């Protein structure tokens, strides 16, 4: 197997913003470890000339989610959002960084 190209570990929100504004495609994303909330993960995605940040939520049963659909791992949440918008008002489908 190959490592995932979307995990960046603990990088500043600003650095994620910086590198993502330079991407050419909508949906370009990365998962980072939140510096504001230790133990939390954040999804940073580019759409248009904008860069948005989503907090990966975890519920009482230990599952991950953004809005309503729950998953068992960050892997599945990410893969599911490659064909389901990550936002309720814009159609942002995750696409690997390039």
């Amino acid at each position: 197997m190959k490592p995932h190209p979307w995990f960046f570990g603990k990088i500043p929100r600003a650095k994620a913003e910086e590198m993502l504004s330079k991407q050419r495609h909508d949906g370009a994303f990365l998962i980072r470890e939140s510096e504001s909330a230790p133990g939390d993960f954040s999804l940073s995605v580019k759409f248009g000339n904008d860069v948005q940040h989503f907090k990966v939520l975890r519920d009482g049963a230990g599952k991950y989610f953004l809005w309503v659909v729950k998953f068992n791992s960050l892997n599945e949440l990410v893969d599911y959002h490659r064909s389901t918008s990550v936002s309720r008002n814009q159609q942002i489908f995750l696409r690997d960084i390039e």
């Binding site: 954040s42 989503f54 936002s87």
Partner: peptide, 7 residues
Amino acid sequence: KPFYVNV
């Protein structure tokens, strides 16, 4: 504080 589209 930092803000998130889903929070």
